[PDB]
Amino acid sequence: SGFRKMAFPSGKVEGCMVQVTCGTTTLNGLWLDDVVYCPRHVICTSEDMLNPNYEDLLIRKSNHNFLVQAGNVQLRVIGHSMQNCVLKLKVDTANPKTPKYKFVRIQPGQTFSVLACYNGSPSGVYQCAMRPNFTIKGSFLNGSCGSVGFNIDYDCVSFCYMHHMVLPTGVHAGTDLEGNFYGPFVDRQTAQAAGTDTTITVNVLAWLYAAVINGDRWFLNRFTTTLNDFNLVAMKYNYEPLTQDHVDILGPLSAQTGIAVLDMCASLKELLQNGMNGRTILGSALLEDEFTPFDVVRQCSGVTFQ
Amino acid sequence: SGFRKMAFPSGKVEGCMVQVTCGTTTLNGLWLDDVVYCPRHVICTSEDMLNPNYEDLLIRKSNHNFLVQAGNVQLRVIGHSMQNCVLKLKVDTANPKTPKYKFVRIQPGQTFSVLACYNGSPSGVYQCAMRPNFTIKGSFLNGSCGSVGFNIDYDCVSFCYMHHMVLPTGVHAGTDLEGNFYGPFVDRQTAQAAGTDTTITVNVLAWLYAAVINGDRWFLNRFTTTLNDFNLVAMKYNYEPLTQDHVDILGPLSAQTGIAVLDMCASLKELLQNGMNGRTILGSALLEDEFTPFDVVRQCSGVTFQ
Numbered sequence: 163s164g165f166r167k168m169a170f171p172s173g174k175v176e177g178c179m180v181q182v183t184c185g186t187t188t189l190n191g192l193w194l195d196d197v198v199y200c201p202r203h204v205i206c207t208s209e210d211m212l213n214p215n216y217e218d219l220l221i222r223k224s225n226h227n228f229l230v231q232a233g234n235v236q237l238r239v240i241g242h243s244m245q246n247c248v249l250k251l252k253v254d255t256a257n258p259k260t261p262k263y264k265f266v267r268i269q270p271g272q273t274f275s276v277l278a279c280y281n282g283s284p285s286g287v288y289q290c291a292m293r294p295n296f297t298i299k300g301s302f303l304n305g306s307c308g309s310v311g312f313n314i315d316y317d318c319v320s321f322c323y324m325h326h327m328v329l330p331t332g333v334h335a336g337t338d339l340e341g342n343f344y345g346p347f348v349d350r351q352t353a354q355a356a357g358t359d360t361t362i363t364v365n366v367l368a369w370l371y372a373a374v375i376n377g378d379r380w381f382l383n384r385f386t387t388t389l390n391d392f393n394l395v396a397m398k399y400n401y402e403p404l405t406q407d408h409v410d411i412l413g414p415l416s417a418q419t420g421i422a423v424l425d426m427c428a429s430l431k432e433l434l435q436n437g438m439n440g441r442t443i444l445g446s447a448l449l450e451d452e453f454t455p456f457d458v459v460r461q462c463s464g465v466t467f468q
Numbered sequence: 469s470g471f472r473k474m475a476f477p478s479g480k481v482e483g484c485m486v487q488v489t490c491g492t493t494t495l496n497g498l499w500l501d502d503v504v505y506c507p508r509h510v511i512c513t514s515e516d517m518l519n520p521n522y523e524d525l526l527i528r529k530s531n532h533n534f535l536v537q538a539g540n541v542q543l544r545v546i547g548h549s550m551q552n553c554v555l556k557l558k559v560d561t562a563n564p565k566t567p568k569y570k571f572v573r574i575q576p577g578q579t580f581s582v583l584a585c586y587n588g589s590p591s592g593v594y595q596c597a598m599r600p601n602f603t604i605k606g607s608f609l610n611g612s613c614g615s616v617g618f619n620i621d622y623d624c625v626s627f628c629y630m631h632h633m634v635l636p637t638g639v640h641a642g643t644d645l646e647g648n649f650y651g652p653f654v655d656r657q658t659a660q661a662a663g664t665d666t667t668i669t670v671n672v673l674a675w676l677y678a679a680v681i682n683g684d685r686w687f688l689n690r691f692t693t694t695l696n697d698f699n700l701v702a703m704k705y706n707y708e709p710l711t712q713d714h715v716d717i718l719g720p721l722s723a724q725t726g727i728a729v730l731d732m733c734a735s736l737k738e739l740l741q742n743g744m745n746g747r748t749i750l751g752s753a754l755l756e757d758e759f760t761p762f763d764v765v766r767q768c769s770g771v772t773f774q
């Protein structure tokens with residue numbers, strides 16, 4: 163049975179990671195067809211990112227200043243464009259490991275897998291959520307920039323995230339693959355606030371259902387509540403307000419457990435209110451909000467791909 | 469910065485997963501060179517696993533009763549041997565995706581990655597520990613059997629685990645790739661007790677160091693203790709006794725933080741004794757024991773492979 167933070171298999175993305183060198187700076191890039199994608203600030207020096215002018219910096223750069231290694235093999239760069247906060251290097255060799263792929267800007271609350279790389283080589287893979295405030299709680303060192311986040315949809319990789327920086331709270335920020343930041347973040351070394359973060363109410367519900375499904379039910383109660391009354395107590399705690407869609411999205415889990423969304427919301431209310439009293443749910447002593455409904459369904463059904 | 473349960477990239481293992489059908493039973497197998505490995509109880513029916521005689525069952529089986537699909541491609545079986553609780557099917561096609569690989573029986577406390585499959589297709593990947601009692605807390609449904617656990621050591625895959633069953637506590641049991649169970653488990657549908665499980669003391673220390681490294685230090689104290697006095701309080705709580713090796717294995721983390729192992733043990737003592745008082749460490753409200761020292765080092769240094 164059991165229940166874990168589970169990442170998509172990383173194979174299709176592994177064959178897309180390359181190393182990108184420009185001057186002294188090296189970071190990771192993503193090699194799809196005859197394009198490599200990486201963060202534009204690859205054209206900056208370790209110390210001169212306080213407030214770059216990226217046009218001006220880039221203008222002093224030519225294709226030949228860009229060193230794209232794939233394992234131990236140089237690609238020749240034959241074009242370069244800047245798209246928002248991303249650099250797009252055209253290369254002569256198309257990736258023969260290019261998977262079926264698309265580029266998607268995910269929404270807050272949605273999860274995805276990260277393949278953390280150093281020097282175009284995979285370190286490891288983990289599952290993440292886009293916090294409502296457009297940060298992610300990941301594991302990135304120096305060199306991790308240009309590491310990508312993704313979903314798999316059968317055979318099709320949806321890349322949704324490229325890693326750019328770590329904020330002062332230790333949480334992480336980055337772009338879509340078109341190079342637009344999630345959040346109000348900018349690619350420059352200044353103090354930057356992630357706003358107040360909130361709990362992804364619907365995800366926490368999905369997780370409570372995952373508990374029930376896996377035999378953990380102590381926290382079920384003999385109360386219900388209204389949607390409105392539940393939200394009144396949610397907001398106190400910085401839970402995202404729950405809506406009718408949330409209800410309907412939880413439908414399948416509702417259906418599979420026979421617990422109406424609002425009975426679960428009543429269970430949840432008293433957990434926020436009275437805490438966990440030192441028990442655990444699915445081995446956790448906190449309310450976990452980084453599993454989507456879909457994530458729980460997949461895990462409690464066995465969904466595969468290739 | 470940040471710190472997460474991180475699995476090895478799953479690519480090299482993905483290309484080894486195949487589906488194995490015998491009668492009505494289908495499960496996963498591992499295709500290395502011209503051998504496929506899977507659990508021997510693939511030769512049982514859904515209901516007749518109460519107490520099989522596997523010799524007798526197997527004797528009524530021929531190569532042609534074994535259907536090895538790789539995606540959409542049949543391998544012909546040309547040999548079959550039973551090795552403890554594993555079946556080894558010789559095939560005509562050698563896997564052309566065979567990685568550098570070895571087979572290792574891990575020790576309790578050691579971690580590894582699981583690539584959970586259904587019908588020879590990857591569902592997802594997660595990191596696991598061999599509990600001191602030789603169970604694992606994983607996420608397995610029906611069809612998951614023959615899913616493998618592994619480590620990567622540069623380019624070399626060390627397979628250490630094959631999944632066989634779920635115990636009544638919901639935790640999971642399985643074999644090495646030579647087919648010997650970890651633990652006192654047997655491949656038959658009877659009530660089976662995992663013994664009392666204990667906390668992997670050294671791993672919890674490694675994690676506390678990982679906290680320190682990532683700026684989380686509140687729980688540090690102004691005490692030390694002896695090794696013996698620490699163990700006296702460990703055992704109360706079902707911590708595995710810590711030894712001098714444990715000390716030395718923590719050396720690198722000791723070194724990197726300037727906190728002697730025994731000062732950390734003193735911090736730890738009072739956490740077991742006084743609990744966490746409702747704070748968290750690396751976002752966790754429990755003491756986490758499924759990161760090895762090595763795991764923490766790798767994560768806090770960036771180790772890659774391919």
Ligand SMILES: *[C@@](O)(c1nc2cc(F)ccc2s1)[C@H](C[C@@H]1CCNC1=O)NC(=O)[C@@H]1[C@@H]2[C@H](CN1C(=O)[C@@H](NC(=O)C(F)(F)F)C(C)(C)C)C2(C)C
Nearest residue numbers: 187208302303304305306307327328329330349350351352
């Ligand atoms: C990443 O891998 C990059 N490194 C370099 C090195 C160069 F020489 C040029 C360009 C780049 S991108 C960095 C990933 C972080 C390393 C440690 N953990 C990380 O997530 N990202 C950065 O260095 C990043 C880039 C410049 C400054 N960055 C920061 O992450 C900085 N944070 C902040 O400025 C803030 F405000 F807290 F978000 C800092 C102080 C180095 C941690 C840029 C934002 C362009």
Ligand SMILES: *[C@@](O)(c1nc2cc(F)ccc2s1)[C@H](C[C@@H]1CCNC1=O)NC(=O)[C@@H]1[C@@H]2[C@H](CN1C(=O)[C@@H](NC(=O)C(F)(F)F)C(C)(C)C)C2(C)C
Nearest residue numbers: 493514608609610611612613633634635636655656657658
């Ligand atoms: C796995 O995938 C297998 N399924 C089948 C189906 C057949 F028809 C033949 C052989 C096999 S192996 C099962 C994985 C579990 C499914 C749900 N979660 C799992 O981990 N494993 C089993 O079905 C496994 C095999 C027989 C009975 N198994 C059990 O896991 C059972 N548990 C126990 O008997 C005990 F004691 F709790 F460990 C049970 C009751 C089905 C959960 C065997 C042990 C050979």
